[PDB]
Amino acid sequence: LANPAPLGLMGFGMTTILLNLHNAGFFALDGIILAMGIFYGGIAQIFAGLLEYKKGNTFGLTAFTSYGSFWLTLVAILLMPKMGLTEAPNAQFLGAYLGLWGVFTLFMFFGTLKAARALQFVFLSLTVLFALLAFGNIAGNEAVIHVAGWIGLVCGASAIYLAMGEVLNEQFGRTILPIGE
Template identity: 75%
Template structure:
């Protein structure tokens, strides 16, 4: 009898996160304004694709994966909402101080999620450590109005997003070839 093997939804979620993070942080680094490319990626790939990956992690029984992917998927959707909802009226736009508080809450959440990676591979640890730093840099930059810090955070965010893309591709290629093609720093055996 052949066991039903479920596919790994992690690479989908990591790619949705990584590519969207890079696009937004190219803006944060000062290269481009926020454009429809960032907004659309935030809704569909950073948002919807990560939520789908989270639901699939639920099916696999992975509490960390479902919590991370669904949370960050909805992070992207709420961020787009913060940008777009004021344009329909009825709601005051979020000022930079309150946006900083919003980002600080995500930083706290991400710090705790980082602790959850300490038994995982080094690649995942790097993604969550760099994301924690990114959220706090963006938080402080928004609260203080420090444009230079926001630009530096943009470069750090590009690195964070690239690390997620690397990990996604490593998981895909390593599984496809049945060997380590791209190393991810496997955790030590218990």
């Protein structure tokens, strides 16, 4: 069976990068972030999680499907007011929501200790990303959100690296991109 991990890391990677260009301040929360969170960071990563089921990878099923659902919850929070369904979110409830996802990311980082180090760097930077976004929203500190953006850019780039690191290593049967096995 094929390896679905690079698809989810690519889905997580490009979607994490784009969101944090806004968090860093390059742009505003554009629909380019919203479209990628629905299909790539969302459904395409949901597909990567469900495909780890027949692979016996409990971590992959848990990681990709959870974060894939996270992007679907993120877009839903931002678009339901534009549909008149809800109110715009409370930033402290957004901080705790971003904080709970940091707790999930934290324990999952310990699950990467016996794994490739490029995946450990992804889950460590994602822990820093979720932790900085949580305190930045609760405290109302826009500077920390700017900091979390640059961490998210590093987080999303390294996720794309491992995605393309796994593919290029399987296509040629040798280490084309070293991932820290």
